[PDB]
């Protein structure tokens, strides 16, 4: 369980790039600060769905 | 009624029994990640 | 079982405060936040103006000659008045105000009544000019919640205008539930309670009174039949 | 006729009026003939930007 | 949004110059172990850890907050590259 | 493996309405009938 | 307002009605909902957590002479209601030994001290002539819903973890009427309806729910 605590310190301040195909415009790739969540699905903000 | 507050929903809600299917596309079989792994023979690029 | 949560308070001034309770079991932020908000907005004892009498005024939709504010605006300012009774046995007082133009009438212009404190003496009531006379008698009661003027319909004398009684000192309640973790438990709840109060009572006191009211009602489930 | 948005929304919380009922609310020093929901929407924008004017 | 991003964009004529300054400053901070920082001890970025409140290891976060203070000088042909690297090592040993 | 329904699994009905499970709520959080029966699935009316 | 009268109407050990009147306007929801949320979530009870069947290695197998497979048998065992008559009892193992042809029910478990089966007529498996069913069902005490993947309790090598639903409360509804006292007619009459599996009576579940809420209200005492 201490590994998961160390993973939080790894991703602190860092961002990841989220991309949905097809990338018709540049906002098809956007940077988000990842929040670690239980499960296997990526949680996406409702307000960026239109751009993607 | 709203289970969180106990107050009713301000308008009547269409509530009924409907037949819903669970499809073969599951996030368990679709989630994938890789840091480093196998590479191509010629292009030396990561496999897919 | 989950460890007892930490109750942290962030109170600024005497009219606003934030209270955080974490960690909580899943769903207990909603379980606790909603009852307290309902009690805070409807059950905290307070004082309010319930009737006003102004000389030479017949109806609420009229206006006094010699003052910028009409009857409605003065009534609206009266609803902003915050008064705190210093005597627990005291139930109702009447505040007298005699003003001559061209002064700006304030809440401090009310005649001092024993065991009666005006929390906001800088509140603006009316603005007078030369030849303007404002003779006003306001009736202050004790109660809870919000009561429309037409509901209680309190009149001390003829031509008295009933006014909406904002008894509750709590101006606004907003509670937020956030997901928190304690080790490998990830479904825990973080409850943040934000209370706005008129200043007669501290938001900490309002929360304490609301918790006591909820606690007292839980003792009602004691003696069957 | 409500003296402030807090009083208008307190009446809504107490069930006297709905968010869509047109009432009189004094806001920004002006006597507005609007609904508490429209007044509520104004407070949403004001608090989000932390600037009421 | 990044804190003070509007102020960061207003200090540069081209938005990509801001990124270059932040990224170059971040590697300067990483190279010297954050000992060359212009931030006061009460101004250092922090992260919440179970053990306690510790310094933020993300140098990009440090670089952005340093630029907001105004103690950093950026531009073209300010100092020779060789002179800059050598002098920083002397006054900030690592 | 015995797979239970989880967040990200795709549900659908016979009328073309499809979607992935995005939230699993406890029983006390779901909307319920006045007799105390909670609903099982909440569907967005905007998809109709 | 004066102290409300509390009225209890019970239909056996599984259903009960609790009336609290008169209450101030708004206290029907203010009191009913928090209890309903606590009743539906945080009431301790007993549930089957692990089952071991002789000559069975996993739950994805069938037993000769038994009509139902292990998955269906485990589904039947999840409906077993076990009442611990001893408050200190935390774990019990129920032993079932049956030989075909018979319809083995929940009443066929070997008797255990301070343990009562609230649904003896529950069907577990159908035994055909020449079929045998030797099971060791472990019943634990807990709260909430614990999937088998979390607790992973295996009393022995071939024991099969079972998803555990410890909550005895089956359904909660609360009802608010227009009651009147004196000259004021906005008062609330709150009626709590509790359905329980029978291991815990609805009166006990209500008492525990009140205590849980009362304890949580003591968390607002010491500011930091
Ligand atoms: Mg059960």
UniProtKB/Swiss-Prot annotation, chain A:
Assembly behavior: The RNAP catalytic core consists of 2 alpha, 1 beta, 1 beta' and 1 omega subunit. When a sigma factor is associated with the core the holoenzyme is formed, which can initiate transcription.
Protein name: DNA-directed RNA polymerase subunit beta'
Species per Swiss-Prot/TrEMBL record: Thermus thermophilus (strain ATCC 27634 / DSM 579 / HB8)
Protein purpose: DNA-dependent RNA polymerase catalyzes the transcription of DNA into RNA using the four ribonucleoside triphosphates as substrates.
Superkingdom of this protein's organism: Bacteria
Family listed: Belongs to the RNA polymerase beta' chain family.
From Swiss-Prot, chain C:
Disulphide connectivity of cysteines: none
Entry keywords, A to Z: DNA-directed RNA polymerase, Nucleotidyltransferase, Transcription, Transferase
GO MF: DNA binding; DNA-directed RNA polymerase activity; protein dimerization activity
Transcription among keywords: yes
Residue numbers spanned by region Alpha N-terminal domain (alpha-NTD): 1-225
Reaction catalysis annotation: RNA(n) + a ribonucleoside 5'-triphosphate = RNA(n+1) + diphosphate
Membrane-crossing segments per the record: none
Enzyme nomenclature, EC number: 2.7.7.6
GO biological process: DNA-templated transcription
One Gene Ontology cellular component: DNA-directed RNA polymerase complex
Subunit text: Homodimer. The RNAP catalytic core consists of 2 alpha, 1 beta, 1 beta' and 1 omega subunit. When a sigma factor is associated with the core the holoenzyme is formed, which can initiate transcription.
Family: Belongs to the RNA polymerase alpha chain family.
Function in brief: DNA-dependent RNA polymerase catalyzes the transcription of DNA into RNA using the four ribonucleoside triphosphates as substrates.
Record comment regarding domains: The N-terminal domain is essential for RNAP assembly and basal transcription, whereas the C-terminal domain is involved in interaction with transcriptional regulators and with upstream promoter elements.
Name this protein carries in UniProt: DNA-directed RNA polymerase subunit alpha
Biological classification of the source: Bacteria, Thermotogati, Deinococcota, Deinococci, Thermales
Portion of the full sequence shown: 5 to 229 of 315
UniProtKB/Swiss-Prot annotation, chain D:
Family label: Belongs to the RNA polymerase beta' chain family.
Lineage: Bacteria, Thermotogati, Deinococcota, Deinococci, Thermales
Function in brief: DNA-dependent RNA polymerase catalyzes the transcription of DNA into RNA using the four ribonucleoside triphosphates as substrates.
Assembly and interaction partners: The RNAP catalytic core consists of 2 alpha, 1 beta, 1 beta' and 1 omega subunit. When a sigma factor is associated with the core the holoenzyme is formed, which can initiate transcription.
Protein name (Swiss-Prot/TrEMBL): DNA-directed RNA polymerase subunit beta'
Disulfide bonds: none
Gene from which the chain derives: rpoC
Residue span relative to the full protein: 842 to 894 of 1524
From Swiss-Prot, chain F:
Domain of life: Bacteria
Subunit structure: The RNAP catalytic core consists of 2 alpha, 1 beta, 1 beta' and 1 omega subunit. When a sigma factor is associated with the core the holoenzyme is formed, which can initiate transcription.
Function recorded in the entry: DNA-dependent RNA polymerase catalyzes the transcription of DNA into RNA using the four ribonucleoside triphosphates as substrates.
Family stated for the protein in its record: Belongs to the RNA polymerase beta chain family.
Protein name: DNA-directed RNA polymerase subunit beta
Organism annotation: Thermus thermophilus (strain ATCC 27634 / DSM 579 / HB8)
Coverage span on the entire protein: 829 to 876 of 1119
